Design a binder for this molecule. Structure first.
Ligand SMILES: Cc1ccc(C(=O)Nc2cccc(C(F)(F)F)c2)cc1Nc1nc(-c2cccnc2)nc2ccccc12
Length: 275
């Protein structure tokens, strides 16, 4: 019961499941309604779950209740006293950031894009400060509300090309490997959801990174933004910025917006000669 100290217990009579929107660890995820009704997403733990699954499920509910931040997905509450058990979160019409950007290519200003990154960074600074390592930070795990506010979430695995070398090589997941992932997310946002490293295979990505190659500048990208994402990709974990540094830089760039007008050179893959 203590694990749920920051959570609100919701009575099952207040919940209606409507459509399956995913598969959980041991159950389905539903779109539904919560008692004027509020649309919600509902992750269930179905009959037969193991002890480890229950510990992980209630632990997830407990940390989500603990988190209270503008840029972290909101937990409405939990059903733990009845079966099936449920984790109930807010629901976003705009959905996941990766698909959102790919469906809105070129529709936002540079300031809007950088504002999204500042929000993600603030949520990640909060998680890291709370001693929570995400391990799967990627645009597909970020929700976008109708104010363009980005909320860090974790929908479980669908991530070599988002993962820092030390996490791949020896399973060292820390806030600093999350920083590497954040740099990849910066590149996803500034490219409107391009696939990191395009068609390179997972092995080719790892070999390129080990050889010293890094993702090139997105088109029309502020110089300061590319500089920041590049420093997230330093091989040496200790040399990467902390999330506090990232938030501070992004905030200062937004608040002095002329700083974003200087653009990094873009390397064309294709030459078009015209008179
Ligand atoms: C129901 C639910 C339960 C848990 C989470 C979730 O983000 N958990 C989580 C776990 C660890 C750390 C964090 C984090 F990020 F730190 F906050 C969040 C999200 C959701 N919400 C959604 N899940 C899912 C989903 C889909 C497939 C598999 N699992 C969840 N899809 C959604 C679609 C639209 C709006 C919300 C959701």
């Amino acid at each position: 019961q203590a694990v749920l100290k920051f959570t609100t217990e919701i009575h099952p009579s207040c919940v209606t499941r409507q459509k399956v929107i995913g598969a959980g660890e041991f159950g389905e995820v539903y779109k539904g309604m919560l008692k004027k009704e509020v649309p919600v997403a509902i992750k269930t733990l179905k009959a037969g779950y193991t002890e480890k699954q229950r510990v992980d499920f209630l632990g997830e509910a407990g940390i989500m209740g603990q988190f209270s931040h503008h840029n972290i997905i909101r937990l409405e509450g939990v059903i733990s006293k009845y079966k099936p058990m449920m984790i109930i979160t807010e629901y976003m019409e705009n959905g996941a950031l990766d698909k959102f950007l790919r469906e809105k290519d070129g529709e936002f200003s540079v300031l809007q894009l950088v504002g999204m990154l500042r929000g993600i960074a603030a949520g990640m600074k909060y998680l890291a400060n709370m001693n929570y390592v995400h391990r799967d930070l990627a645009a597909r795990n970020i929700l976008v509300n109708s104010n363009l506010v980005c909320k860090v979430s974790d929908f479980g695995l669908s991530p070599i090309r988002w993962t820092a070398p030390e996490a791949i090589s020896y399973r060292k997941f820390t806030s600093a490997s999350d920083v590497w992932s954040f740099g990849i997310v910066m590149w996803e946002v500034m490219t409107y959801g391009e696939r990191p490293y395009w068609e390179l295979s997972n092995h080719e990505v790892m070999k390129a990174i080990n050889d010293g190659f890094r993702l090139p500048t997105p088109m029309d990208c502020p110089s300061a933004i590319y500089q920041l994402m590049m420093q997230c990709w330093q091989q040496e974990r200790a040399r990467r910025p902390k999330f506090a540094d990232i938030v501070s830089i992004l905030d200062k760039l937004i608040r002095a917006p002329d700083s974003l007008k200087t653009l990094a050179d873009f390397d064309p893959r294709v030459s078009i000669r015209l008179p």
